Amino acid sequence: RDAQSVLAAIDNLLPEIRDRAQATEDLRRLPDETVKALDDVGFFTLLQPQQWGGLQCDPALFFEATRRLASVCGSTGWVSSIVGVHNWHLALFDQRAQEEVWGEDPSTRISSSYAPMGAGVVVDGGYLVNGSWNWSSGCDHASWTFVGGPVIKDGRPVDFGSFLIPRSEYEIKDVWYVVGLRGTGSNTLVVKDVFVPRHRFLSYKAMNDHTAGGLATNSAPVYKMPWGTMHPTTISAPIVGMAYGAYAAHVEHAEAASDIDAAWRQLIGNVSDEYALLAAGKEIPFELRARARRDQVRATGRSIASIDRLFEASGATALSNEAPIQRFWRDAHAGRVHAANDPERAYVIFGNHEFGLPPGDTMV
Amino acid sequence: RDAQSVLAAIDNLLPEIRDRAQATEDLRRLPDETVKALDDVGFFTLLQPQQWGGLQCDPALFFEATRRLASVCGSTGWVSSIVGVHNWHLALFDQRAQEEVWGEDPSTRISSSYAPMGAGVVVDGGYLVNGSWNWSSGCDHASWTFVGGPVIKDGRPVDFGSFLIPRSEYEIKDVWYVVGLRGTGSNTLVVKDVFVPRHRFLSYKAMNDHTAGGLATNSAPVYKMPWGTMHPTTISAPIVGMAYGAYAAHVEHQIAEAASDIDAAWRQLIGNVSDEYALLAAGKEIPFELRARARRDQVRATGRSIASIDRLFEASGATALSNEAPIQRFWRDAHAGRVHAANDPERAYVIFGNHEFGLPPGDTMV
Amino acid sequence: RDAQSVLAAIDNLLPEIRDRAQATEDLRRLPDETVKALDDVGFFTLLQPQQWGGLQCDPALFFEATRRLASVCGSTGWVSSIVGVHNWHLALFDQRAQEEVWGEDPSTRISSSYAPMGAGVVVDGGYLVNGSWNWSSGCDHASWTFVGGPVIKDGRPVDFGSFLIPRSEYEIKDVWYVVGLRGTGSNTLVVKDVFVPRHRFLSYKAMNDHTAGGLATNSAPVYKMPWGTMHPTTISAPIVGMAYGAYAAHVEHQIAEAASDIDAAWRQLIGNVSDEYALLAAGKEIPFELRARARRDQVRATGRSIASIDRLFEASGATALSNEAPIQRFWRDAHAGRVHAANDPERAYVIFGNHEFGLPPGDTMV
Known part of the structure; x- marks a missing residue:
């Protein structure tokens, strides 16, 4: 296999x-x-x-x-x-x-809510974590979660990253009643005074440093892909796919099919360009990572424009609850609202360790 | 008077x-x-x-x-x-x-360092504040200071603002040995386990809400000006004046549009301040689109100004580099200002829409 | 070796x-x-x-x-x-x-100050030279110097070039207290009533003519490179290296196209040098259009480089201003270089078509 x-x-x-x-x-x-x-x-x-x-x-x-x-x-x-x-x-x-x-x-399996909706306070051997983290897609099907936030020591932020916490230490609150992506069960993880040992924290700095502890034992070149590419592409790729779905919903019932294709080739083109350099033991240029960031919005923007055209060119039946196309339309749009609210859009601007964050240019 | x-x-x-x-x-x-x-x-x-x-x-x-x-x-x-x-x-x-x-x-007088380089943790009666805040311009001439950061409650950020703290409760570390703005004494403020009562913290949310406590006793329309305009104009205005200085220094020692770019940058910057104030004087609200223009104009004004200072610096003779030449000083001071402006965290705060770190919605900050 | x-x-x-x-x-x-x-x-x-x-x-x-x-x-x-x-x-x-x-x-070693800040008046056997020439980079490490200026004969300019003069015959005035390029010791050379024999003056006309005397004994193709390329590249090349320095310093302390603008500026500058040299190695002539491109590329290379140094300086943290930060130094050194380049009189010599001040036709200088 x-x-x-x-x-x-x-x-x-x-x-x-x-x-x-x-x-x-x-x-x-x-x-x-x-x-x-x-x-x-x-x-x-x-x-x-x-x-x-x-x-x-x-x-x-x-x-x-x-x-x-x-x-x-x-x-x-x-x-x-x-x-x-x-x-x-x-x-x-x-x-x-x-x-x-x-x-x-x-x-x-492992879920996440990487937005900073809590913090880890330095205690002996690790961190005491508190917070309430929303939007954890698939959290009902994972027995561990990441949660993101700053590390606080002697009353001040000193680091930022992800805390890995087992299911017995958090509660899932069912809040997921939404316009689109309804089936994702993107519920809320409530964390109260949970001790997390240092080995179950990974700093954004270390990831972008190439000093993450996992890299000593996991040497495949895919683990050297930049976070600033892998993380947004995780969201962009299914959104592009939803445009393929809207299109096939429109057949089964102009430049659309090919504007979608072009959005796909652009998004994935940046991933394979990046990976091809790592697999040849080369470094990924900043310019490439900056280009992949800008193409996140170009590609989901093109896909969603195609979906809106298709939605409006599928008969009056398009509006019906019984109609696949309005589902793909709602889901892609819900996705782009999640994307447009991503706090890393701002992190990339930080240059001075604000809230324990790494230099912004490392996050691109 | x-x-x-x-x-x-x-x-x-x-x-x-x-x-x-x-x-x-x-x-x-x-x-x-x-x-x-x-x-x-x-x-x-x-x-x-x-x-x-x-x-x-x-x-x-x-x-x-x-x-x-x-x-x-x-x-x-x-x-x-x-x-x-x-x-x-x-x-x-x-x-x-x-x-x-x-x-x-x-x-x-009161100095500031609004960058989040510390925090206040909720205690009985107020906050325990800790941190180390740099770039506090004119701090040696103040007997109180503002320091910015989040409020931490129950182990997480729940608010963000400024803590007002008297001079007896922090230390000024003298660290100001720099390429430009040398006379500003923008030194560092070290704060350790300082109790700040609730009336000496003011949230960015409250300021942008029009719910700041001081508004109940200070009714003048100027107190209604937006933070997102007042705060960067504080920096952009003297940078613009620094371009007027470079110009005068260049005239005194002896482009197409150095002089007129500088005056255009000024009309544009002070123009947004006048428009906002003119609405508040009339009992009117400032629209979001006006605060938004005023923000984009901060870089345009300061960018045009610095560009002109650059042309001037390069067209004032081979001696322009001398330590005795006024024009290198305006040049260094202006660029130093620009580094401060380009390092402002509020350029990122505006993008936040979800209460990140206790902050208010980013459009209120613009 | x-x-x-x-x-x-x-x-x-x-x-x-x-x-x-x-x-x-x-x-x-x-x-x-x-x-x-x-x-x-x-x-x-x-x-x-x-x-x-x-x-x-x-x-x-x-x-x-x-x-x-x-x-x-x-x-x-x-x-x-x-x-x-x-x-x-x-x-x-x-x-x-x-x-x-x-x-x-x-x-x-030999220093220079090619700017016309003195003259040589024709006497029996050579020239009586007088003047005061600034910006002589590394002069404290040379035991001879070039100084540039016209030859005055019968009460008017009749030629323009460089006078070669030994260290015993001028005074170095230490005046180098400047904002950038501080370690270059670009001091001032004071020359009073110095006899220079004819074999120690070399005309710009002769150099551009291919009639310089040294060509009779130094036949290597490099000696055939044009002055109008060699002379400004002397300045533009280290300014470009200064951008490579700023980049490394920015990486060490922690744009879209800072790194690739810098490498493009370099390929472009060194490219014109290689193209010219490649023709001379083949026994071929350099065309005017190539020397012309090489001139316009001096500002493009150095402009791109400095722009990138500027973005870098502004994106290396609020401490970038500190005297201990490598990046402010590359920034100051690069800008100081640019002031020198923008103050070069040869930018005007190229325009002269009529032997003004003893100069050769301006297109020979390009």
Whole structure:
């Protein structure tokens, strides 16, 4: 079993997922059956390190899988991209954190809410974490979470990064009643006085430094991809895929099909350019990372324009609750509102360690 | 004595300030003589409330004053602007805080370092504040300071604002050995385990809300000016004056549009201040689109100004590099200003829409 | 020992030169240690003729050497470029002048001040020279100098060029207290009633004519490079290296196109040098259109470079102003360079078409 065969297995899975699209929406979280299928097929394995049975794959393939899923159910491609890429992010934590998550069951999953809605206060051996973090897509299908925030020491921020916390230490609050991406169950994680040892914190500085502890044991070049590319592409790729779905909803019933194609080639082109340099042991130029950032909005912007045109060119029946196209329209738009509210848009401007953050140019 | 006579009297000061310019750089902080002079002619009263003997003046006149000062000594104009506008900011604090600062001596001055380099953790009665804040322009001439940062409650940020703290409770570390703005004495403020009561913190949300406590006792329309305009104009105005200085220095030693770019940058900057103030004087609200223009104009004004200073610096003879040449000083002072402006965290705060770090919605900051 | 091994050996020098950078500024002239080091690895021989033990090297390699030096210490790269290229210039003087400088010690160095700040009046046997010439970079490390000016005969200018004069015949006035390029010791040369024989003047007409006396004994193709390219590249190359320095300093302390603008400015500058040299190596003539491109590229390269240094300076943190920050130094050194380039009289000489002041036709100067 390999990257290519997982992709094929996913292709085979699409009709089932398409027929439960509306069910998924009504549930407000992915059906266990979708999650079980994705697991069985090896999807969560794609960016997971080899030492845990994972395929540490070309990131372009991982994002292609998310595009396929999204083309059939916006919510499913969204949750899959986000929860699958967390296996990439965990590969960068020190080896003991990876063991604690994967050492018994390597199919264990990890959710996130990286927005700074809490903080870790330095205590002996780690941090005491408190906060209430919203928007954790797929959190009902993960037994660990990341939560983002600053580290506070002697009453001041000194660092910023992600805290890894097991499910027994947080509560999920069901708040997910929304206009689109309804089936993502992007619920709220409530964290009260939870001790987190240092080995289960990973600083944004270290990730962008190439000094993340996971890199000593996980050497595949995909783990050297920049955070500033992997993180927004996680969101952009399914949104592009939802445009493929809107288009196929419009057939099954101008420049559209090809404006969508061009949005895809641009988004993924930056990923493979980046990866091709790492696989040849070269460095990724800042200019390339800056270019990939600007193309996030160009590509989701082009996709969503195509979706709006299609939505308005599908008969009056387009407005019906019973109509796939309005679902892909709502889901892509919900996605872009999430994207447009991303606090890293601002982090990139910081140059002076504000709130424990790394130099902004490292975040690009 | 009104705003117009203060402005008139600042004019009488310019020759003396100009002469002292190298001495000011050498001191690395403003000479007592120039601070006393400015205090005597009433400069610090300009934006101070009338209940304290201030002129609560037209904010465009206050910025014009700083432009003139900076046209003779960049560091003097810089410190004057920043230290004077803090009398505006204290006016929005609740009356008890104002009483503590000014109740005995209404000539008392307040420095700032608004960058988040510390925090206040909620305790009984207020906040325990800790941090180390740099770039506090004119701090050696103040007996209180503002320091910016979040409020931490129950182990997380829940608000963001300024803590007002007396001079007995922090240490000034002298670290100001720099390429430009040498006479501003922009030193570092070290604060350890300092209790700040609630009436001495003012949230950015409250200021932008029109709910700041000081508004209940300071009713003048100037106190209704937006933070997102007043705060950067504090910096941009003396940088613009520094371009007027470079120009005069270039004329004295001997482009197509150096002179007219500088005057256009000025009309544009002070224009947004006048438009906003004109609405508040009429009992009207400032629209978001106006505050938005005023923000984009900060870089345009200061960018045009600095570009012209650059052409001037390059067209004043091969001696323009000499330490004795006024034009290298305006050039260094102006560029140093620009580095400060480009390092302002509020350029990022405007983008935040989700209460990140206790901050208010970013569009309120614009 | 060839040009390639010298370049290799300069690389070994860079760490030591970088460390000395603040010390160099403080001295206000290059430390003996760095001049000796450069002399020892053979740097000054690069463009010196083979009859004197020089390498009469590919001029693109000489400029690369200065780029590397300036990427660690702007002042060192600046002085190195200017003092080294004068061994190129002396090669065009007639053999008797070269013999006077180098006949005993071929390691002897020559400073310049080519700006017309003096004149030579025709006398029996040569010229009586008088003047006061500033900005002579590295003059404290030379035992001869060039000074530029017209020849006055029968009461009017009849020619224009450089007079070569030994150290015993002028005074160095120490006047170098400046905002940037502080370690270059660009001091002033005072010359009073000095007899210069005819073999120690070289006309700009003769150089541009291909009739310089030194060409009869120094046949290497490099001696055929145009003045109008070699002379400004001397300045532009280390300014470009200074941008490479600012970049490295910004990376070390922690734009879209800062790095790639800098490398594009370099390819463009060194590209015109390579194209010209490639024609001379083939026994071919350099066309006017190529020298013309090379001139317009001096401002483009140096402009792009400085713009990038400016973005960098503004994006390296609020401490970028500190005297201890490498990036302010590259910034000041680069801008100081630019003031020198913008004050060059040859920008005007190119426009003259009528022998004004003894000058050759302006298109020969391009």
